[PDB]
Design a protein around this ligand. Structure first.
Ligand code: DGD
Ligand code: CLA
Ligand code: CLA
Ligand code: CLA
Ligand code: CLA
Ligand code: CLA
Ligand code: CLA
Ligand code: BCR
Ligand code: BCR
Ligand code: BCR
Ligand code: LMT
Ligand code: HTG
Ligand code: CL
Ligand code: CL
Ligand code: FE2
Ligand code: MG
Ligand code: MG
Lengths: 79, 334, 62, 29, 36, 451, 37, 342, 35
């Protein structure tokens, strides 16, 4: 076809200069996404202390179609 | 020459319509005995006390089975791994009660199919071929050894070998999932990858070659008429096939070497099925699938279920119901 | 004794690590084979003696 | 644990190091 | 485009994959998902 | 780079080691370096086991496979398999580890520095695969070595402290074997025993006198066979039967190793004499037999008459008969009635399990061992959750028996494949068609058609 | 446990049994050095 | 070439590292969204509100146990659009309600359409017959029947397969216990096609490799092939004689052989799809009525078919309460079917 | 049962003997190329 061979690209000093910075910056950005707790709130995933209230015996299961969003909200308020 | 040298010449003759050979000399009688016993038992055998609890299970068509429910039933748990030939029994009546036909079938069958594998090596030598077709066959053969011999050995009984029938096979699968969590075993997973991949590459190879047949036939006649038995020229264009597939994915994701391509076709399902066989042969000794039951715990210590735990709930259903009269003590240890 | 043992064993460990690298590299090197052959023989001798020393001293720290 | 990871790092590198040492030296690889 | 030899790039990338995968196995035994 | 490419050797990189077939010096290197890895693992693995080892927990709860091997030889253990001294464990690991540096040295030297071929340099050490006399002579040397190896076992057993004897009267203990079994009717008798249930061929050997006598026989046989092979060349019927080539000798050895792997799998799975349950954990049959014993004890303590208690099926809940009439445990464990074990034999009389003894003579230590073995059955998951497949996480256990059986079934299996691969390749190469069919001398084209 | 005098070499001992696997991996580094010729 | 359309066509069909084509405008974003939806969900997204389950690396799951799980049964067959009436543009809520499930299922469905168009498009440009595309209809019939038809016949998407390794296993066991799917003759033809396909794959690759002509000197035989060479690299004649004498029959026609390799697994997967359409409606092959009547009347009549139904009834009773949380099943201990002891 | 046992033992010995003597009878030579 046309494109520069991968062989060339990944043995070239310029490749390693660019990616010795971009690879670790992305990795660290990935790490912070979790370490700040940011992941939990974007996706709405419970932390280990947020699955159940202290005395709750049942799961906060969605049972309503059109107000399920509001149910989660209610279920979330009492934790 | 002498009578013996003539015999040897015949046995090993490359000219018999079906090759006989030295492996064949063991294969022919064992496979005939297994076949004949199997057919007669499948049609007519009385019920077999598989679990040695005087609870005879009906396998045969005359005793109320159809093709789907029918089976030759494993020999009695009271026998275990004891050798139970016809002459060890007081009568055929007793032999049938205790599942003697099963041992006769599976022993002659295993010897015969092992010789079937040897015979494949043998003929290829007689014909000046490279010798490894027999190695490809070792994969299904190993799988047959896994369910008819190794598993019984590990568990202490032929009553736990796979039953020689359709519904019987399913019973074996289900009890196996309960006792070993086979689905969560990576060798079984490699087996699935092996057979799903085998199917896939089959559909692929079939389709790539077919799509590439050279125009040799009329718009009305089958394209199969475009290929003649023994012709020296290759009947399809592999460069066109590669041109297609290399573009479907990317160039280097595609084969242009027929030899390495056919190697991959041999290796992928054969290796995956080896792992399947080895899955069953190692769960034979109770090294089981991954257990992540109650693996996720919350801050307090509440168990947070995963899909592994729902698997556990289904396995439990199988466990407590299987062989519903055979257990007296709380743990099922074989 | 206990300090003596531990250095002797640390020294075996360190010598070992230099043998592990040095012996293959030496053996497959084009030029330097005069100086190499001698040291290999020397390192080998030091390594053996050090095994005996740790072996004997074991009985004083154990 | 830091001791373990360091040990496995030094042992881990010994292999490729040799190869590299021979490659730089145009050795009999 | 030839400076760093492909065998080193492969040995290094290959060691990274081992390390990150080794870490994932360690985490099976520690923290969330460890059953403890 | 003398034939270290595909062009020169005609073997691709992934078949690289086939390049060594006629390079005796480099090949000796491969072999010595390899034995170094073996001896290395043995020594380092031992040390790792010893570092992790808590003497008061059973070996079998600790993931140990090598310490149990050392202990069975009588090192480091006392009555009941109690660890009295870990230093022999230590000695065994260190000496293997040091020794492996020596082998590794030799291996690396011959592989990389010494003469690639040995024939120019020496005729004693040089060899041609097709020299039937040299081949039987090397073979003969190793037979003598192997023989001495068997006699070292004997030496340990009779003259250097004895062996761990799970059957020792009064309880398991180390014991000197003074009267080994020499009668060929017994020793060779084992070889003619059926491999099926209640028989078990050689796996059945149930006393150290037989084990010692067997090794006396084997050491002698092997030295004798070694002398024989140094002094002789193969008879013509042997010459006409075999392929005579490096690749073919490999294939025969591959077949014998696969077979041995399989035997080893059954040995560790069933046998509790040379794999004492004190070290290795209970066998599957043993653990199953322990459960019925445990509930028989419990229930009878509660007032049950265990002999006349009819189970739901009509068979006895606790006791029943084997197909030959012997009294045996009931429920599923009926299959395991061939099991024999030192915590159980005291209850067995001439007719099988004795109801008089069961009612009166069950000692606390028997209850204890049965409870122990019931709850260490060799069942667990690949991630080492002990228990049935539906068990919750809590117990970190897979029996050493399952690890040793499973690993060796896999190894024996692939070795069998290896055997078929190399046997078939050796046959084809000897006849000259291992690279494919000659387009101008295609055998099938010269044969009559089938129909 | 290791005798106390050796405790220092404990973490080293924890990593040694893995060394054989590293020899298999090394063959592949080496073959890559020589282009898999 | 002329107008903008033809210029665009030029650009789409350029011979590059990854072909694009017109099918690529469909294929690439839908394949990428389906896959990144899967990796995103399995990495970060819970199933707590829909199933009462953890299902992500974030929560402690591993590769075998993570999933993007189906929405709650109360969602019915809702499309569950981000901007639909359930989530109302709230991304977090959407994730919590099962939005990634339909996201992955629908993008995956359009991606699969795109892939098969890519197969028709490439074959047309290379000038080959489009058999590969036709073969791919089998994966399509499986995806559509199992991921769409099935849950559409049932009460809601909740009962579709969830996208995960362990989740799919659960799906298997549910089909055994509830539908007795192993008994179903359409699943059996599926098995025959898959195992027969795998057999045909192993056996064809091994046969070629063991009747190769010697076209080189190398003991490694891969180099003794040339893509442009006129001749067969292996002997059909010897292969035919070998199988005829071994098995009793052999292929003689290479075009037949390959067509058959397409036919067997493709037909297999199509048959399984038909059975799964049946199961969408609980139209099972569950029972043999004649066995039930005999077994009801004769308590000494037993077969493997009766034995497996006791297993199924164990599976239903024991897995349903946690597997179907919206039913609020409470099954007191005394009602659970169990054999002796266990 | 005894005559059955003896008949089968004889059967099996016969076929086993054929297999053993069979492969002892110059098998490597029974191929189409180098003999
Ligand atoms: C040259 C090769 C040519 C071959 C030609 C064919 C010849 C026939 C071979 C027979 C096949 C064996 C089947 C039965 C195997 C079995 O039940 O094996 C079990 C026996 C062990 O038997 C057990 O032996 C036990 C011995 O323990 C007894 O004694 C012990 C002493 O401590 C303990 O006390 C213990 O509690 C006590 O019970 C008991 O007797 C048990 O009842 C008994 O079941 O193992 C053994 O005999 C060891 C040998 C068996 C090998 C393992 C089989 C694997 C087969 C290969 C599969 C791969 C093929 C792949 C193809 C592709
Ligand atoms: C047990 C494993 C094992 C062993 C013992 C060997 C041994 C050998 N191989 Mg095979 N090989 C193996 C596995 C092994 N191989 C695997 C897994 C592959 C596939 C990747 C191959 C693929 C292969 C090819 C393609 C070739 C070989 C060749 C060879 C031989 C020559 C090596 C050489 O010239 O290196 C040169 C390499 C170096 C100089 C780098 C250093 C190598 C040394 C030995 C490393 C030692 C490090 C060690 C830690 C030192 C301890 C020292 C201490 C005791 C003092 C040698 C006998 C060659 C051949 O047969 O020659 C005729 C050949 O062409 N091998
Ligand atoms: C005979 C072989 C053998 C056996 C039976 C054991 C058994 C055991 N070991 Mg030892 N070990 C071995 C060899 C063996 N190991 C080797 C070669 C090494 C060096 C890497 C070790 C180093 C070692 C350490 C460091 C530890 C153990 C531990 C353990 C225990 C737990 C093992 C476990 O959790 O596995 C988990 C399972 C796996 C990792 C899966 C193995 C699957 C393989 C790769 C499948 C491939 C099959 C086949 C070989 C490939 C053929 C390919 C085909 C295409 C041809 C158990 C008692 C642990 C312990 O308890 O010590 C006290 C422990 O910490 N082992
Ligand atoms: C079984 C493996 C084996 C075999 C068949 C050989 C054979 C050979 N070697 Mg190699 N080698 C080995 C392993 C082996 N060696 C090991 C382990 C090392 C490291 C110590 C070496 C290091 C080595 C070097 C550095 C050289 C050789 C050389 C030689 C040649 C001459 C040897 C001689 O004449 O001594 C005759 C006999 C003696 C001197 C007495 C031997 C005393 C032994 C060690 C004691 C008895 C051992 C006993 C059986 C226990 C063995 C341990 C076992 C349990 C593992 C010959 C080709 C030479 C060479 O190739 O020339 C160019 C050479 O320079 N060897
Ligand atoms: C590694 C060990 C080993 C190996 C590889 C060999 C290899 C060889 N031996 Mg030597 N031998 C050995 C050890 C070994 N021997 C020992 C320890 C002794 C002393 C007892 C001998 C005494 C000896 C004699 C007296 C003779 C040989 C001969 C031979 C040659 C052909 C053997 C043959 O065809 O047997 C294959 C087996 C047969 C042909 C017998 C028929 C096959 C039966 C039916 C198989 C039954 C086994 C079955 C699988 C069940 C296993 C368990 C069983 C006990 C029930 C070959 C060079 C011959 C020769 O050439 O001498 C120079 C010969 O006459 N050997
Ligand atoms: C080929 C590319 C492609 C295709 C076929 C789809 C298809 C789908 N997407 Mg996906 N998506 C894509 C690329 C694609 N997407 C890209 C690149 C992104 C990143 C921005 C997304 C991000 C995304 C999200 C976040 C969601 C989807 C969703 C959907 C689904 C519903 C879409 C819908 O209802 O549209 C309605 C609109 C049309 C069909 C366009 C109509 C075009 C006609 C021909 C012209 C009409 C124009 C109109 C008259 C002018 C304006 C009107 C004005 C007069 C009022 C469906 C499976 C949803 C889903 O998966 O829910 C589970 C959802 O929540 N997509
Ligand atoms: C796997 C699916 C698939 C494939 C590979 C083909 C392949 C083919 N079609 Mg067939 N088609 C299909 C499904 C498919 N079709 C469906 C479901 C219909 C509707 C009934 C059609 C209707 C149809 C007609 C009427 C014709 C073809 C023809 C063709 C051929 C030329 C290509 C073409 O016209 O594509 C058409 C394009 C597509 C199938 C892709 C459409 C992509 C849509 C627009 C994305 C929509 C996004 C959506 C709005 C998001 C909302 C989701 C919602 C749930 C929220 C080729 C044989 C022509 C022919 O046979 O030539 C001889 C022809 O005349 N198609
Ligand atoms: C040939 C070849 C090869 C291979 C090789 C080999 C196989 C080698 C081996 C080697 C070896 C085999 C080595 C070894 C070594 C060892 C050592 C070096 C050791 C030492 C030891 C010590 C030092 C000890 C110490 C101690 C003590 C004493 C006490 C306790 C603790 C401790 C442990 C610390 C390869 C593949 C690469 C390829 C190429 C070619
Ligand atoms: C130690 C011990 C003991 C003893 C032992 C012994 C005594 C052993 C022996 C062993 C033996 C004594 C073995 C043998 C083996 C053999 C074999 C294994 C064989 C093989 C063969 C073959 C392989 C052949 C082949 C062929 C044929 C068949 C035909 C023709 C061709 C040919 C030649 C190829 C006892 C138990 C007491 C106790 C414990 C311990
Ligand atoms: C959903 C969504 C979206 C999208 C997103 C995306 C598109 C994403 C992507 C994502 C991604 C794209 C990610 C990635 C990931 C990856 C990973 C995470 C990987 C891992 C890997 C590993 C771990 C490896 C492994 C292995 C194998 C595979 C075999 C060989 C060996 C080993 C073991 C190494 C949007 C915004 C539109 C909207 C809304 C929704
Ligand atoms: C239970 C197993 C039985 C144990 C027996 C094993 C011990 C070994 C005995 C070997 C003695 C027989 O030796 C072997 O026998 C047969 C029959 O006589 C011979 O006879 C054969 O010779 C040639 C060999 O090219 C054949 O083509 C010919 O058809 C045949 O007559 C073999 O050439 C001979 O080498
Ligand atoms: C958005 C994809 C739909 C493409 C089909 C419509 C083609 S439409 C076509 O386009 C020409 C340029 O190629 C114009 O010159 C012409 O006026 C117009 O009729
Ligand atoms: Cl059942
Ligand atoms: Cl029981
Ligand atoms: Fe093909
Ligand atoms: Mg964790
Ligand atoms: Mg430590």
């Amino acid at each position: 076809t046309g494109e520069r061979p991968f062989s060339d690209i990944i043995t070239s000093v310029r490749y390693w200069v660019i990616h010795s910075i971009t690879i670790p910056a992305l990795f660290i950005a990935g790490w912070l996404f979790v370490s700040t707790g940011l992941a939990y709130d974007v996706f709405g995933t419970p932390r280990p202390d947020s699955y159940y209230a202290q005395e709750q015996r049942s799961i906060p299961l969605v049972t309503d179609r059109f107000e399920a969003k509001q149910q989660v909200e209610t279920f979330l308020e009492q934790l | 020459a002498n009578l013996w040298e003539r015999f040897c010449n015949w046995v090993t003759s490359t000219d018999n319509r079906l090759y006989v050979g030295w492996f064949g000399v063991i294969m022919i009688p064992t496979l005939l005995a297994a076949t004949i016993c199997f057919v007669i038992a499948f049609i007519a055998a009385p019920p077999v006390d598989i679990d040695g609890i005087r609870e005879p299970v009906s396998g045969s068509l005359l005793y109320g089975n159809n093709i789907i429910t029918g089976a030759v039933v494993p020999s009695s748990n009271a026998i275990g791994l004891h050798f139970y030939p016809i002459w060890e029994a007081a009568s055929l009546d007793e032999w049938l009660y205790n599942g003697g036909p099963y041992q006769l079938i599976i022993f002659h069958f295993l010897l015969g199919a092992s010789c079937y594998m040897g015979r494949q090596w043998e003929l290829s030598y007689r014909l000046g071929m490279r010798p490894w077709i027999c190695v490809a066959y070792s994969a299904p053969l190993a799988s047959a050894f896994a369910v008819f011999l190794i598993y019984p050995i590990g568990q202490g009984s032929f009553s736990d070998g796979m039953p020689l029938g359709i519904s019987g096979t399913f019973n074996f699968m289900i009890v196996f999932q309960a006792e070993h969590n086979i689905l969560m075993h990576p060798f079984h997973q490699l087996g699935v990858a092996g057979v799903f991949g085998g199917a896939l590459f089959c559909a692929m190879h079939g389709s790539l070659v077919t799509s590439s047949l050279i125009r040799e036939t009329t718009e009305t006649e089958s394209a199969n008429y475009g290929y003649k038995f023994g012709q020296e020229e290759e009947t399809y264009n592999i460069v066109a096939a590669h041109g297609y597939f290399g573009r479907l994915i990317f160039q280097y994701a595609s084969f242009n070497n027929s030899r390495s391509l056919h190697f991959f076709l041999a290796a992928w399902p054969v290796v995956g099925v080896w792992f399947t066989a080895l899955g069953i042969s190692t769960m034979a000794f109770n090294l089981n699938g991954f257990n992540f039951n109650h693996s996720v715990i919350d801050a307090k210590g509440n168990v947070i279920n995963t899909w592994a735990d729902i698997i556990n709930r289904a396995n439990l259903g199988m466990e407590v119901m299987h062989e519903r009269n055979a257990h007296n003590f709380p743990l099922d240890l074989a | 004794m206990t300090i003596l043992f531990q250095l002797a064993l640390a020294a075996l460990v360190i010598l070992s690590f230099v043998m592990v690298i040095g012996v293959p590299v030496a053996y497959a090197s084009p030029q330097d084979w005069d100086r190499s052959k001698q040291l290999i023989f020397l390192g080998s001798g030091l390594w053996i003696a050090l095994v005996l020393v740790v072996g004997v001293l074991n009985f004083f720290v154990v | 644990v830091i001791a373990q990871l360091t040990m496995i790092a030094m042992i881990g590198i010994a292999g490729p190091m040799i190869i590299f040492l021979l490659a730089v030296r145009r050795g009999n690889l | 485009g030839g400076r760093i030899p492909l065998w080193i790039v492969a040995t290094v990338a290959g060691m990274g994959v081992i390390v990150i995968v080794g870490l994932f196995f360690y985490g099976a035994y520690a923290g969330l998902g460890s059953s403890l | 780079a003398t034939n270290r490419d595909q062009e020169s050797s005609g073997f691709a990189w992934w078949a690289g080691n086939a390049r060594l077939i006629n390079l005796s010096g480099k090949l000796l290197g491969a072999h010595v370096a390899h034995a170094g890895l073996i001896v290395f693992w043995a020594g380092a693995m031992t040390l790792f086991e010893l570092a992790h080892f808590i003497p008061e927990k059973p070996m079998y709860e600790q993931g140990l496979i090598l310490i149990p091997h050392i202990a069975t030889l009588g090192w480091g253990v006392g009555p009941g398999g109690e660890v009295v001294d870990t230093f022999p464990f230590f000695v065994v690991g260190v000496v293997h580890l040091i020794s492996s540096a020596v082998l590794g040295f030799g291996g690396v030297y011959h592989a990389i520095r010494g003469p690639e071929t040995l024939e120019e340099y020496s005729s004693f050490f040089g060899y041609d695969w097709k020299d039937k006399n040299k081949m039987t002579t090397i073979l003969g040397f190793h037979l003598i070595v192997l023989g001495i190896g068997a006699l070292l076992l004997v030496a340990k057993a009779m003259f250097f402290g004895g062996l761990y004897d799970t059957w020792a009267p009064g309880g398991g203990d180390v014991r000197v074997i003074t009267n080994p079994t020499l009668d060929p009717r017994v020793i060779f008798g084992y070889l003619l025993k059926s491999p099926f249930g209640g028989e078990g061929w050689i796996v059945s050997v149930n006393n150290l006198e037989d084990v010692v006598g067997g090794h006396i026989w084997i050491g002698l046989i092997c030295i004798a066979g070694g002398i024989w092979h140094i002094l002789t060349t193969p008879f013509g019927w042997a010459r006409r039967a075999f392929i005579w080539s490096g690749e073919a000798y490999l294939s025969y050895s591959l077949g014998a190793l696969s077979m041995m792997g399989f035997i080893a799998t059954c040995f560790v799975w069933f046998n509790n004499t040379v794999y004492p349950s004190e070290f290795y954990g209970p066998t599957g049959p043993e653990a199953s037999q322990a459960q019925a014993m445990t509930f028989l004890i419990r229930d009878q303590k509660l007032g049950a008459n265990v002999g006349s208690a009819q189970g739901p099926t009509g068979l006895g809940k606790y006791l029943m008969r084997s197909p030959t009439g012997e009294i045996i445990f009931g429920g599923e464990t009926m299959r395991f009635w061939d099991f024999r074990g030192p915590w159980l034999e005291p209850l067995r009389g001439p007719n099988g399990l004795d109801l008089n003894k069961i009612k009166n003579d069950i000692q606390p230590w028997q209850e204890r061992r049965a409870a122990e073995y019931m709850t260490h059955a060799p069942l667990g998951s690949l991630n080492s959750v002990g228990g049935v497949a539906t068990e919750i996480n809590s117990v970190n256990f897979v029996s050493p028996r399952s690890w040793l059986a499973t690993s060796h079934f896999v190894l024996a299996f692939f070795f069998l494949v290896g055997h078929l691969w190399h046997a078939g390749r050796a046959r084809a190469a000897a006849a000259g068609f291992e690279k494919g069919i000659d387009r101008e001398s295609e055998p099938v084209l010269s044969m009559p058609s089938l129909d | 446990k290791l005798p106390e005098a050796y405790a220092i070499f404990d973490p080293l001992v924890d990593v040694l049994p893995v060394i054989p696997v590293l020899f298999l991996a090394l063959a592949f580094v080496w073959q890559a050095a020589v282009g898999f010729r | 070439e002329r107008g903008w359309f033809d210029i665009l066509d030029d650009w789409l069909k350029r011979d590059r590292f990854v072909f694009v084509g017109w099918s690529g405008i469909l294929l690439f974003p839908c394949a990428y969204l389906a896959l990144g939806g899967w990796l995103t969900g399995t990495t970060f997204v819970t199933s707590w509100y829909t199933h009462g389950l953890a299902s992500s690396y974030l929560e402690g799951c591993n590769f075998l146990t993570v999933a993007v799980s189906t929405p709650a049964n109360s969602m019915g067959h809702s499309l569950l659009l981000l901007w639909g009436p359930e989530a109302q543009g709230d991304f977090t809520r959407w994730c919590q309600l099962g939005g990634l499930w339909t996201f992955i299922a629908l993008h995956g469905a359009f991606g699969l359409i795109g892939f098969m168009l890519r197969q028709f498009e490439i074959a047309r440009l290379v000038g080959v017959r489009p058999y590969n595309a036709i073969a791919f209809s089998a994966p399509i019939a499986v995806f559509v029947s199992v991921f769409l038809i099935y849950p559409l016949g049932q009460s809601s998407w909740f009962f579709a397969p969830s996208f995960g390794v362990a989740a799919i296993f659960r799906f298997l066991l549910f089909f055994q216990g509830f539908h007795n799917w192993t008994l179903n003759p359409f699943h059996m033809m599926g098995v025959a096609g898959v195992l027969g396909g795998a057999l045909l794959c192993a056996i064809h690759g091994a046969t070629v490799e063991n009747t190769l002509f010697q076209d080189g000197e190398g003991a490694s035989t891969f180099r003794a092939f040339n893509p442009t060479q006129a001749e067969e690299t292996y002997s059909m004649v010897t292969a035919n004689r070998f199988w005829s004498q071994i098995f009793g029959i052999a292929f003689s026609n290479k075009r037949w052989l390959h067509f058959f390799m397409l036919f067997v697994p493709v037909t297999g997967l199509w048959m399984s799809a038909i059975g799964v359409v049946g199961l969408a409606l609980n139209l099972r092959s569950y029972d043999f009525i004649s066995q039930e009547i005999r077994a009801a009347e004769d308590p000494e009549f037993e077969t493997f078919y009766t034995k497996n139904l006791l297993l199924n009834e164990g599976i239903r009773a024991w897995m349903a309460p946690q597997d179907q949380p919206h039913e609020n099943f409470v099954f007191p201990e005394e009602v659970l079917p169990r054999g002796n002891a266990l | 049962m005894e005559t059955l046992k003896i008949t089968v033992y004889i059967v099996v010995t016969f076929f086993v003997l054929l297999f053993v003597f069979g492969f002892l009878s110059g098998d490597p030579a029974r191929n189409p190329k180098r003999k």
